[PDB]
């Protein structure tokens, strides 16, 4: 069938066999012109999507046309194609067909080889060339003369025209007429190129196609863009009224009529000069594969290797396929199917260059994966790259160029609440080739790293979702979006710490209502001593935490000075402490420097947009952990779609923990032991329940490593006011893992890195927030012993779990947050029967 | 427009052909975004570009994810919208509390979906939709509950996607109001919509609809919805609850109609 070999120099001059695409459109095409040779205006209109194959197939018409001579009944001789825009700026269209059929017939006449036939024929050709030579100046006078009356009267002619005077369509007719004779041949074909660069350059095409080539031995193959086309007759047809009339009548109904008139005059014009059924588009590939459901009307096979056999060919919709589910890093789904779609919409030439320059690239490889398919989409579809302010330099490309684009596409698109999973679903064809560039870009960074899959989790991800609650009830709002980008840096980050202490500045900005003084990835604290606070012991201090506990919590402490120096308290500094304590060697003497980087309290100004030892048994398991993750961090292969998903579940959740939590706050809510208790511990608690649950649940739906997922059937909810949801799924997953002889560190490397991070094991369990009720305890017991089958170690022993739930030294759980206080709080309620 | 009109006919009647999930992005994402923007022209109707230009870029009208979450936008358009008697049955949803009222008469008290067991636990969430706000609010409408069934005829027969179909809309998304605002028994559940769908697959072949037939079955749909939303509105007594006479109503009395509104629209119309 076709057959495209991708190891070939692309030269659309060498497309001569099983290198292109068109040819069953063409053949229709071609025997479709022949088809009007028998049966007096043959104008076929090829429209293009600005270039879709435009050039390349308009002379495949050509090419086919010419040399099929002795085998076809009737035959046709094409003239070279015409570009109107490269024409003399006052030459007719008229004077240009002529001249080049006047060559075609001069070297038909050197060809022949009787010498009486020669002589006669040649006499007849300058015969008419003369005649029009001497009507040419009716084209082009600025003024009649009456001497032309004298010539128009001239009935000296040997070959008698019909109507009398002197008009150039007879004229032309006859000289066309005597050019299929010389040339042996019917229905010469006119073919003209596109107007875009200079489209005024086309009234001049369109008037000569409706004047003088309406003989039945001329078609024309015209190509542009109809609404280009409409454009130019429309203002032409406004030039026929006077101008007075156009200053004189200048009310509405007046106006509103003569806009009727040329709707109606430009309407049939070009049904006139481009009749629907001549009107032939050039099929995109995706409408000759289909949709991989139904029996498409072709069928395409591609090359990807060099040597493989015609049966041994891949379809293209596979070809494609094999790129986009590798390249993207992306579990084979529907997903998957839709940016294959978009792929299959481009220009034939242009799907082809870009799998030429990725499968030859990986040949090479054979002797990284998303760098190929970046690579090969960068050096074929820039145009849409840089026509979106992107970096479109490959040498410059990080994880801090990574988020500007990011939100650039964003902004540009205008998709704030779900852009960030880089759906083309835009409605420019630049907007959408640049989601599958940044998928490309996405998986090609965040792969085989854990840091840089939560920077761009928090960073990347983050800062879609938060400017869209939070950042958009005042909006100048393109103001607003370089000072909010100015805040916290998107297009260079010294750290992911300084984007999480800056975060909790812009949440906390927005006024909770009616005062409770909670918000969404944390709570407020109160540095001030409460007067007479009911219950518990005094506010809180960093220095009471043991070893570890004090490791978590201060680092996830951020203070930010706003009417006040403020203190602030957020999952979102703990997920921004992992990563640059993660990115960073495994040496210890290099690790602590990362490691106090996160602790070493700093300040955060204001948003503008806003009106205003003991402590190194933790530095050694970090160091454990650390050496864990550079080994497993390489098997992930993170997702736009992925880390998209990740954080889309994980903004549900905060937002729901803080909307039930809030009313929660008792006088009794310290140490809670029944789900109606809920203080400061129970609610950061569910936070990081919230960011395990969200890694576990869409790594196993959306992780590439894994080809189906294994939370079951059933309703996938979040861990709010509850633990249950989170235990069961984590059965659930392990259940189903050891019956088929997968673990955790190699089917869920990222939870498993997660879920063993030293930092995040004072939070998990604290003792304020376990909730452990008689029902609550048989789930939470069982939700211990599984995280402890997949970090391997049990983080708190049996007789610390005792301890929490019965009501000496902990060092891997905090112990202020269970009486700790919180700005806003009404300490005059308590908890009901 | 009166040319524009045969041809927009015929490409309801080409895109919507040889399908049933097709069918329902017409009637939920084509003829509703007119009717719901129908309460905007008579509440604001210079603005008006900038309420079509607001308007189509939150509904997402031309880049719609899926049925169900345009039902999501929906559900927010049809509630910060202007209102009187500060009624949680709106046109097209019932607003639910989340949070325990004092003083509750008879069983009332705020939902919970675990009482549903089996598919009904799926049909219960998929007619659920969640908006947020300064407060955040939950609704239970008839526009998500096709906005269910129109994700799940587009899927494969696979368990693998139908159990997909289930978990889109439900802890994933988080809807916030539009700019223009002031401020296992569930294998078994999967297994009636496989075999069901397995019926769509063959009996949706012979599909022919019109955009007069989605037009019409729109227009009872909503027409039906305007009733309920002021019929049944009034009837909050304390004995609805368990209620078996006609005055009588409550929320499952507001979703049976709004239910079998959308069945009598395909049916009477079909």
């Given at each position: 069938?076709?057959?495209?070999?991708?190891?070939?120099?692309?030269?659309?001059?060498?497309?001569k066999?099983?290198?292109?695409?068109?040819?069953?459109l063409?053949?229709?095409?071609?025997?479709?012109?022949?088809?009007?040779?028998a049966?007096?205006?043959?104008?076929?209109?090829?429209?293009?999507?600005?270039?879709?194959?435009?050039?390349?197939?308009?002379?495949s018409?050509?090419?086919?046309?010419?040399?099929?001579?002795?085998?076809?009944?009737?035959?046709?001789?094409?003239?070279?194609?015409?570009?109107?825009?490269?024409?003399?700026?006052?030459?007719?269209?008229?004077?240009?067909?002529?001249?080049?059929?006047?060559?075609?017939?001069?070297?038909?006449?050197?060809?022949?080889?009787?010498?009486?036939?020669?002589?006669?024929?040649?006499?007849?050709?300058?015969?008419?060339?003369?005649?029009?030579?001497?009507g040419?100046?009716?084209?082009?006078?600025?003024?009649?003369?009456?001497?032309?009356?004298?010539?128009?009267?001239?009935?000296?002619?040997?070959?008698?025209?019909?109507?009398?005077?002197?008009?150039?369509?007879?004229?032309?007719?006859?000289?066309?007429?005597?050019?299929?004779?010389?040339?042996?041949?019917?229905a010469?074909?006119?073919?003209?190129?596109?107007?875009?660069?200079?489209?005024?350059?086309?009234?001049?095409?369109?008037?000569?196609?409706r004047?003088?080539?309406?003989?039945?031995?001329?078609?024309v193959?015209?190509?542009?863009?109809?609404?280009?086309?409409?454009?130019?007759?429309?203002?032409?047809?406004?030039?026929?009224?006077?101008k007075?009339?156009?200053?004189?009548?200048?009310?509405?109904?007046?106006?509103?009529?003569?806009?009727?008139m040329?709707?109606?005059?430009?309407q049939?014009?070009?049904?006139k000069?481009?009749?629907?059924?001549?009107?032939?588009?050039?099929?995109?590939m995706?409408?000759?594969?289909?949709?991989?459901?139904?029996?498409?009307?072709?069928?395409?096979?591609?090359?990807?290797?060099?040597?493989?056999?015609?049966?041994?060919a891949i379809?293209?919709?596979?070809?494609?396929?094999?790129?986009?589910?590798?390249?993207?890093?992306?579990?084979?789904?529907?997903?998957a199917?839709?940016?294959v779609?978009?792929?299959?919409?481009?220009?034939?030439?242009?799907?082809?260059?870009?799998?030429?320059?990725?499968?030859?690239?990986?040949?090479?490889?054979?002797?990284?994966v998303?760098n190929?398919?970046?690579?090969?989409?960068?050096?074929?579809?820039?145009?849409?790259?840089?026509?979106?302010?992107?970096?479109?330099?490959?040498?410059?490309?990080?994880?801090?160029?990574?988020?500007?684009?990011?939100?650039?596409?964003?902004?540009?698109?205008?998709?704030?609440?779900?852009?960030?999973?880089?759906?083309?679903?835009?409605?420019?064809?630049?907007?959408?080739?640049?989601?599958?560039?940044?998928?490309?870009?996405?998986?090609?960074?965040?792969?085989?790293?854990?840091?840089?899959?939560?920077?761009?989790l928090?960073?990347?991800?983050?800062s879609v979702?938060?400017?869209?609650?939070?950042?958009?009830?005042?909006?100048?709002?393109?103001?607003?979006?370089?000072?909010?980008?100015?805040?916290?840096?998107?297009?260079?980050?010294?750290?992911?710490?300084?984007w999480?202490n800056?975060?909790?500045?812009?949440?906390?900005?927005?006024?909770?209502?009616?005062?409770?003084?909670?918000?969404?990835?944390?709570?407020?604290?109160?540095?001030?001593?409460?007067?007479?606070?009911?219950?518990?012991?005094?506010?809180?201090n960093?220095?009471?935490?043991?070893?570890?506990?004090?490791?978590?919590?201060?680092?996830?402490?951020?203070?930010?000075?706003?009417?006040?120096?403020?203190?602030?308290?957020?999952?979102?500094?703990?997920?921004?402490?992992?990563?640059?304590?993660?990115?960073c060697?495994?040496?210890?003497?290099?690790?602590?420097?990362?490691?106090?980087?996160?602790?070493?309290?700093?300040?955060?100004?204001?948003p503008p947009?806003?009106?205003?030892?003991?402590?190194?048994?933790?530095?050694?398991k970090?160091?454990?952990?650390?050496?864990?993750?550079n080994?497993?961090?390489?098997?992930?292969?993170?997702?736009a779609?992925?880390i998209?998903?990740?954080?889309?579940r994980?903004?549900?959740?905060?937002?729901?923990?803080?909307?039930?939590?809030?009313?929660?706050?008792?006088?009794?809510?310290?140490?809670?032991?029944?789900?109606?208790?809920?203080?400061?511990?129970?609610?950061?608690?569910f936070?990081?329940?919230?960011?395990?649950?969200?890694?576990?649940?869409?790594?196993?739906?959306?992780?590439?490593?894994?080809?189906?997922?294994?939370?079951?059937?059933?309703?996938?909810l979040?861990?709010?006011?509850?633990?249950?949801?989170?235990?069961?799924?984590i059965k659930?997953?392990?259940?189903?893992?050891?019956?088929?002889?997968?673990?955790?560190?190699?089917?869920?490397?990222?939870?498993?890195?997660?879920?063993?991070?030293?930092?995040?094991?004072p939070?998990?369990f604290?003792?304020?927030?376990?909730?452990?009720s008689?029902?609550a305890?048989?789930?939470?017991?069982?939700?211990?012993?599984?995280?402890?089958?997949?970090?391997?170690?049990?983080?708190?022993?049996?007789?610390?779990?005792?301890?929490?739930?019965?009501?000496?030294?902990?060092?891997?759980?905090?112990?202020?947050?269970?009486?700790?206080?919180?700005?806003?709080?009404?300490?005059?309620?308590?908890?009901?029967a | 427009?009166?040319?524009?009109?045969?041809?927009?006919?015929?490409?309801?009647?080409?895109?919507?052909?040889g399908?049933?999930?097709?069918?329902?992005?017409?009637?939920?994402?084509?003829?509703?975004?007119?009717?719901?923007?129908?309460?905007?022209?008579?509440?604001?109707?210079?603005?008006?570009?900038?309420?079509?230009?607001?308007?189509?870029?939150?509904?997402?009208?031309?880049r719609?994810e899926?049925?169900?979450h345009?039902?999501?936008?929906?559900?927010?358009?049809?509630?910060?919208?202007?209102?009187?008697?500060?009624?949680?049955?709106?046109?097209?949803?019932?607003?639910?509390?989340?949070?325990?009222?004092?003083?509750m008469?008879?069983?009332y008290?705020?939902?919970?979906?675990?009482?549903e067991?089996?598919?009904?636990?799926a049909?219960?969430?998929?007619?659920?939709?969640?908006?947020?706000?300064?407060?955040?609010?939950?609704?239970?409408?008839?526009?998500?509950?096709?906005?269910?069934?129109?994700?799940?005829?587009?899927?494969?027969?696979?368990?693998?996607?139908?159990?997909?179909?289930?978990?889109?809309?439900?802890?994933?998304t988080?809807?916030?109001?539009?700019?223009?605002?002031?401020?296992?028994?569930?294998?078994?559940?999967?297994?009636?919509?496989?075999?069901?769908?397995?019926?769509?697959?063959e009996?949706?072949?012979?599909?022919?609809?019109?955009?007069?037939?989605?037009?019409?079955v729109?227009?009872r749909?909503?027409?039906?919805?305007?009733?309920?939303?002021?019929?049944?509105?009034?009837r909050?007594?304390?004995?609805?609850?368990?209620?078996?006479?006609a005055?009588?109503s409550?929320?499952?009395?507001?979703?049976?109609?709004?239910?079998?509104?959308?069945?009598?629209?395909?049916?009477?119309?079909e």
């Open positions: 069938k076709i057959i495209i070999n991708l190891f070939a120099p692309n030269l659309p001059g060498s497309t066999e099983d290198d292109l695409i068109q040819k069953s063409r053949d229709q095409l071609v025997e479709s012109i022949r088809n009007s040779i049966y007096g205006r043959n104008v076929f209109f090829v429209d293009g999507t600005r270039g879709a194959g435009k050039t390349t197939f308009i002379n018409v050509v090419k086919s046309l010419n040399s099929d001579q002795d085998d076809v009944k009737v035959n046709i001789k094409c003239l070279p194609t015409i570009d109107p825009t490269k024409l003399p700026r006052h030459e007719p269209i008229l004077v240009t067909v002529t001249a080049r059929l006047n060559k075609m017939v001069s070297d038909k006449l050197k060809g022949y080889w009787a010498s009486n036939d020669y002589r006669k024929q040649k006499e007849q050709w300058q015969n008419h060339l003369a005649q029009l030579q001497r040419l100046h009716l084209l082009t006078d600025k003024e009649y003369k009456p001497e032309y009356f004298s010539d128009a009267l001239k009935l000296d002619a040997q070959l008698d025209y019909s109507i009398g005077g002197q008009d150039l369509s007879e004229i032309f007719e006859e000289l066309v007429k005597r050019a299929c004779e010389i040339l042996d041949c019917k010469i074909l006119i073919t003209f190129d596109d107007i875009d660069t200079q489209f005024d350059a086309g009234w001049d095409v369109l008037e000569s196609i004047k003088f080539f309406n003989s039945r031995k001329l078609v193959v015209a190509t542009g863009d109809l609404r280009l086309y409409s454009q130019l007759i429309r203002g032409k047809q406004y030039e026929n009224y006077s007075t009339l156009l200053e004189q009548e200048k009310e509405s109904v007046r106006l509103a009529e003569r806009g009727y040329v709707e109606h005059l430009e049939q014009y070009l049904l000069l481009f009749p629907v059924q001549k009107r032939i588009q050039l099929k995109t995706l409408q000759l594969v289909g949709e991989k459901g139904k029996a498409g009307k072709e069928e395409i096979k591609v090359k990807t290797e060099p040597g493989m056999q015609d049966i041994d379809d293209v919709r596979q070809a494609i396929g094999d790129a986009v589910r590798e390249g993207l890093n992306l579990r084979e789904g529907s997903d199917d839709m940016y779609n978009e792929l299959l919409k481009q220009p034939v030439r242009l799907l082809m260059q870009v799998l030429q320059d990725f499968y030859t690239k990986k040949y090479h490889a054979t002797s990284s998303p190929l398919l970046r690579n090969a989409l960068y050096g074929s579809m820039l145009s849409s790259i840089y026509r979106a302010g992107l970096n479109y330099e490959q040498h410059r490309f990080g994880m801090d160029s990574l988020c500007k684009d990011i939100f650039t596409y964003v902004k540009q698109d205008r998709d704030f609440n779900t852009g960030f999973y880089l759906r083309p679903q835009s409605e420019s064809e630049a907007l959408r080739n640049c989601s599958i560039y940044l998928a490309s870009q996405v998986s090609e960074n965040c792969q085989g790293s854990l840091s840089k899959f939560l920077q761009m928090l960073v990347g991800c983050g979702s938060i400017f869209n609650q939070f950042v958009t009830e005042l909006a100048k709002f393109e103001q607003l979006i370089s000072e909010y980008v100015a805040y916290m840096s998107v297009g260079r980050i010294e750290s992911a710490s300084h999480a800056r975060c909790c500045a812009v949440v906390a900005n927005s006024p909770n209502d009616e005062k409770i003084g909670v918000f969404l990835g944390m709570v407020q604290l109160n540095r001030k001593s409460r007067q007479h606070m009911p219950g518990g012991y005094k506010k809180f960093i220095d009471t935490e043991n070893g570890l506990a004090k490791a978590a919590m201060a680092s996830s402490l951020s203070t930010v000075a706003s009417n006040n120096l403020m203190d602030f308290c957020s999952v979102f500094n703990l997920i921004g402490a992992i990563a640059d304590i993660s990115a060697r495994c040496e210890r003497s290099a690790i602590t420097n990362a490691f106090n980087k996160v602790i070493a309290q700093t300040t955060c100004i204001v947009w806003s009106e205003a030892t003991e402590f190194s048994d933790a530095i050694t970090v160091e454990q952990w650390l050496k864990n993750v080994e497993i961090e390489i098997g992930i292969r993170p997702s779609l992925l998209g998903k990740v954080w889309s994980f903004y549900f959740n905060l937002n729901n923990v803080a909307d039930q939590h809030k009313t929660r706050l008792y006088r009794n809510a310290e140490h809670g032991r029944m789900a109606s208790q809920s203080n400061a511990a129970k609610i950061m608690r936070n990081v329940l919230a960011f395990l649950h969200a890694v576990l649940v869409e790594e196993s739906l959306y992780h590439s490593v894994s080809d189906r997922e294994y939370i079951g059937e059933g309703l996938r979040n861990p709010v006011t509850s633990v249950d949801e989170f235990e069961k799924k659930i997953i392990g259940e189903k893992l050891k019956a088929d002889n997968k673990t955790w560190k190699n089917t869920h490397p990222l939870f498993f890195l997660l879920i063993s991070c030293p930092i995040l094991h939070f998990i604290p003792v304020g927030g376990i909730n452990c008689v029902k305890l048989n789930k939470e017991t069982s939700f211990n012993k599984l995280i402890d089958e997949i970090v391997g170690d049990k983080l708190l022993s049996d007789e610390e779990w005792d301890y929490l739930t019965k009501n000496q030294i902990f060092q891997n759980t905090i112990t202020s947050l269970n009486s700790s206080t919180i700005v806003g709080a009404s300490y005059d309620k308590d908890t009901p | 427009l009166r040319n524009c009109s045969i041809y927009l006919a015929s490409q309801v009647s080409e895109n919507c052909q399908s049933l999930s097709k069918f329902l992005q017409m009637l939920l994402v084509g003829c509703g975004s007119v009717s719901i923007f129908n309460q905007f022209v008579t509440e604001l109707a210079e603005k008006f570009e900038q309420l079509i230009s607001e308007y189509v870029a939150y509904m997402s009208v031309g719609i899926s049925a169900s345009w039902a999501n936008r929906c559900c927010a358009v049809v509630a910060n919208s202007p209102n009187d008697e500060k009624i949680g049955v709106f046109l097209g949803m019932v607003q639910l509390n989340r949070k325990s009222r004092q003083h008469p008879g069983g008290k705020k939902f919970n979906i675990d009482t067991n089996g598919l009904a636990k049909a219960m969430a998929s007619s659920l939709s969640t908006v947020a706000s300064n407060n955040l609010m939950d609704f239970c409408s008839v526009f998500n509950l096709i906005g269910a069934i129109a994700d799940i005829s587009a899927c494969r027969c696979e368990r693998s996607a139908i159990t997909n179909a289930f978990n889109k809309v439900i802890a994933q988080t809807c916030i109001v539009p700019p223009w605002s002031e401020a296992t028994e569930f294998s078994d559940a999967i297994t009636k919509v496989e075999q069901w769908l397995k019926n769509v697959n009996i949706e072949i012979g599909i022919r609809p019109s955009a007069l037939l989605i037009g019409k729109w227009s749909f909503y027409f039906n919805l305007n009733n309920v939303a002021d019929q049944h509105k009034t909050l007594y304390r004995n609805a609850e368990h209620g078996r006479m005055s009588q409550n929320a499952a009395k507001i979703m049976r109609f709004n239910v079998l509104a959308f069945l009598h629209a395909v049916l009477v119309e």
